[PDB]
């Protein structure tokens, strides 16, 4: 928790506040991984990184939406609440993707 009194930054932790985590495990959200968006994990392990913000795009006739323009509300998904003593874990099985070509002809 960050407190700002007279421009003095005092940072004391909340042993009660919760942080939500959930995985879009049915791809029913607009997939935004896959354009090399600069928010990915730090090349050097020690490097502490800031988690990038999630914001999608939909249809747009100019800058105005259309009827098909979808609005996915993230909280409408079953989250999981971690509150400083819990951990999250999902195991994912990669589908049969062909071997990449690591060789020059």
């Amino acid at each position: 928790e960050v407190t700002d009194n007279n421009g003095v930054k005092t940072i004391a932790n909340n042993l009660t506040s919760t942080v939500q985590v959930f995985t879009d495990s049915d791809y029913q959200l607009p997939y935004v991984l896959g354009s090399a968006h600069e928010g990915c994990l730090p090349p050097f392990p020690a490097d502490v990184f800031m988690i990038p913000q999630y914001g999608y795009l939909t249809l747009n006739d100019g800058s105005q939406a259309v009827g098909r323009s979808s609005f996915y509300c993230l909280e409408y998904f079953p989250s999981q609440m971690l509150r400083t003593g819990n951990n999250f874990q999902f195991s994912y099985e990669f589908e049969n993707v062909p071997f990449h070509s690591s060789y020059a002809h």
């Binding site: 029913q28 959200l29 098909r68 979808s70 609005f71 996915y72 509300c73 409408y76």
Partner: protein, 105 residues
């Protein structure tokens, strides 16, 4: 995929060719080797029934903006859409597509 739309099948449902057999009218008393071109005019009638079970793929999108659907306009008009005219002729006013729901790429 046939460019007019539909399904491309290597073995589509077969043709059902129907012919009502010739019945020669009255061949001569004396023999004659020709093809006996004098048949009695006739036709047929019946019913034909085609039961063709489809398989669906139900939709489970987590979209929050209401989907776009196909409806028949509520407004007074001389004839109901897709309903017979005063003379009995069945009139279809507009072609109906099959792409109304929305699924993200």
């Amino acid at each position: 995929s046939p460019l007019m739309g539909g399904f491309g099948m290597k073995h589509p449902p077969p043709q059902i060719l129907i012919k009502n057999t010739p019945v020669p009218a009255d061949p001569p008393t004396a023999f004659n080797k020709d093809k006996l071109n004098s048949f009695i005019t006739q036709y047929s009638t019946g019913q034909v029934s085609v039961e063709i079970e489809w398989e669906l793929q139900k939709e489970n999108s987590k979209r929050w903006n209401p989907e776009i659907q196909y409806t028949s306009n509520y407004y007074k008009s001389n004839n109901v859409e897709f309903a017979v005219n005063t003379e009995g002729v069945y009139s279809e006013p507009r072609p109906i597509g099959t792409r109304y729901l929305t699924r993200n790429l």
